[PDB]
Amino acid sequence: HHSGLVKMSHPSGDVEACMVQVTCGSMTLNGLWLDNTVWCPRHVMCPADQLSDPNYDALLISMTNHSFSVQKHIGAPANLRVVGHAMQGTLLKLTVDVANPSTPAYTFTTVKPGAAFSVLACYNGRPTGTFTVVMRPNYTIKGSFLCGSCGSVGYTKEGSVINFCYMHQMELANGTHTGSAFDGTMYGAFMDKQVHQVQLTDKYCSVNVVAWLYAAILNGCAWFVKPNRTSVVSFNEWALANQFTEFVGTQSVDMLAVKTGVAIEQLLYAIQQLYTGFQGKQILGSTMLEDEFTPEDVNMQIMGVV
Amino acid sequence: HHSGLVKMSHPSGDVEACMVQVTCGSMTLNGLWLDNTVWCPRHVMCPADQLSDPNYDALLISMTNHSFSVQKHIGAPANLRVVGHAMQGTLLKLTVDVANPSTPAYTFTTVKPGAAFSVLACYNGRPTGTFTVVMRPNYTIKGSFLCGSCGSVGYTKEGSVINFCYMHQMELANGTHTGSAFDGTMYGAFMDKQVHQVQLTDKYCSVNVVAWLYAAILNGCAWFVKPNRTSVVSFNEWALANQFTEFVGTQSVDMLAVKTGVAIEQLLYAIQQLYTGFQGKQILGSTMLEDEFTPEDVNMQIMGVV
Numbered sequence A, B: 001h002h003s004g005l006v007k008m009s010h011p012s013g014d015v016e017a018c019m020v021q022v023t024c025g026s027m028t029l030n031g032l033w034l035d036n037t038v039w040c041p042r043h044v045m046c047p048a049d050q051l052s053d054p055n056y057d058a059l060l061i062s063m064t065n066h067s068f069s070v071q072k073h074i075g076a077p078a079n080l081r082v083v084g085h086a087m088q089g090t091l092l093k094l095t096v097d098v099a100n101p102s103t104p105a106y107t108f109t110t111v112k113p114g115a116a117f118s119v120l121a122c123y124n125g126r127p128t129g130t131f132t133v134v135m136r137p138n139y140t141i142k143g144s145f146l147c148g149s150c151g152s153v154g155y156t157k158e159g160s161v162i163n164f165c166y167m168h169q170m171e172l173a174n175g176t177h178t179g180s181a182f183d184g185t186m187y188g189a190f191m192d193k194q195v196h197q198v199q200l201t202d203k204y205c206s207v208n209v210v211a212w213l214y215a216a217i218l219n220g221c222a223w224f225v226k227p228n229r230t231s232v233v234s235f236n237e238w239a240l241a242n243q244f245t246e247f248v249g250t251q252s253v254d255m256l257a258v259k260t261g262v263a264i265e266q267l268l269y270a271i272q273q274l275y276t277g278f279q280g281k282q283i284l285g286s287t288m289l290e291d292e293f294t295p296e297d298v299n300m301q302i303m304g305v306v
């Protein structure tokens, strides 16, 4: 029995029309062209022999508008003339002569651990794929990025408005990925320099495990449900000792509780037991807890609620 | 350690620009607008009290061009006047007065079990999400489709050319999904009528399990590799008894063998052993064989080869 759950991304067309190639000498990556501004990672300015410890302030001052080449390849080809440049945190803000005529309605937002967003993976300014990820508790994502993907963008969508939340910067030693918000801050404690960096311990996202257990119930799979209950306060003390995020309920989780008639606290109890072992049983085809689906995913994909 | 593998879809913008709403009385679903033609499921013609056994030939003859309303909502709104109608298998081919100015370069192809394709899930002619699936050996997909999603399209991409391979029609009792190719034939033995239908037994896609084991090796995870080997012929006799597809090698699998230096036959042997049990070990975070990633996925996402 298939749960009806897939890794669902937003349609990517609105964002595809904003992607450009940014080159600064022998360095090339992707940028995001909104209005008269092109956002890209600041290490486009860095030569390779300096990626391990750039002085980005001195690199910035050494740039001229002439130093940057911006090109659009897909759909409406163009060379964009750079007329201003500035640095915000780990991003460059280039000002260009032409406003993107396909600029969608948009905002900049930061994404929180456990929340999902869509990524448009791009190489040389050309969109090549799209996928969805959850921000992990250690501020990494389990993405799929290769050399040249920096500047690829992550976003969510509220109606027609695109909320840009991620610009790709780096790959960590364990194969996960991280980047910047559009305020220029890196997620987590990471720095945009090519040095091994301590990364924090990941955790299970409790709210997303609860969501998945509700998805299972919505599919007729409820062997793990008991009248036994664990309170949120007690579960959260357990979580701290057992590599779980503390649980914080939301209206989306409450809708699942109402639809199924199973209380959150019954699933917090179940999580405690299932963490010790599934005892040879499966939940939605899995022998391990799943935390890559959000309450909103379950409401939308199974219940048709947005 | 993350494998670097995600469920990757093609960017969807080219296809988003081809989606329309098709209505025939009290029935509404999605269609695909290419050139002067709109493709949609033929059960748009069916009233609800007849979905269990339509006479599609008589329904067809009862239609007029007046009977169909075609609308585009996103990007370049329009009402398309229908000037001809015809039925091919389980699809309608409407001829409309306006050629889609955003028609991409395209072909129609059929997808084979084990092969992956991207789906653009649409409701009322509006794209709402995108995801990627593998055609299962029983000619179903493990999708995420709700009421009103019929007419959503699946496709692959070779360069700039979109190969349309799927139009969504139905949900089976076990929660999986199926639809039509654009020659109008349903995948599998299924029929586009609202009746319980026997569905065939699914199987593990051996070639995709091999691909995943290579992905594991490419990530430094090779505990399951032994010098022991099972020949393709012998494995395929085993597969028939154990719910696996017979293995057929491809150049993409051979590239993985060359890169890793592990022979296909070593992984066929491993599959036989792992099927009996992982003995408490994990492969890329999993305690079960994974067949949802193709050799091409592994070559592209991990090795950067297209």
Ligand SMILES: *[C@H](O)[C@H](C[C@@H]1CCNC1=O)NC(=O)[C@H](CC(C)C)NC(=O)OC[C@@H]1CCC(=O)N1Cc1ccc2c(c1)OC(F)(F)O2
Residues within 6 Å of the ligand: A029, A043, A051, A145, A146, A147, A148, A149, A150, A151, A169, A170, A171, A172, A173, A174, A175, A176, A177, A191, A192, A193, A194, A195, A196, A197
């Ligand atoms: C930009 O296009 C590019 C994207 C990378 C390339 C490979 N996949 C990606 O996502 N970014 C960088 O190459 C980046 C540029 C800096 C200026 C930010 N450098 C980078 O990732 O450098 C190595 C990285 C920095 C932080 C860290 O711990 N490392 C070392 C490291 C060690 C072992 C690794 C690894 C990274 O990735 C690994 F594959 F998982 O194994």
Ligand SMILES: *[C@H](O)[C@H](C[C@@H]1CCNC1=O)NC(=O)[C@H](CC(C)C)NC(=O)OC[C@@H]1CCC(=O)N1Cc1ccc2c(c1)OC(F)(F)O2
Residues within 6 Å of the ligand: B029, B043, B051, B145, B146, B147, B148, B149, B150, B151, B169, B170, B171, B172, B173, B174, B175, B176, B177, B191, B192, B193, B194, B195, B196, B197
């Ligand atoms: C078109 O928009 C729609 C798409 C469906 C709706 C729910 N999710 C989808 O993907 N198609 C239909 O509703 C389709 C129209 C026919 C004219 C083809 N009918 C349909 O799916 O009817 C039920 C189906 C036909 C084949 C079959 O075995 N069934 C019965 C059945 C029984 C139990 C089910 C189930 C389907 O889906 C389930 F949820 F998994 O449980």
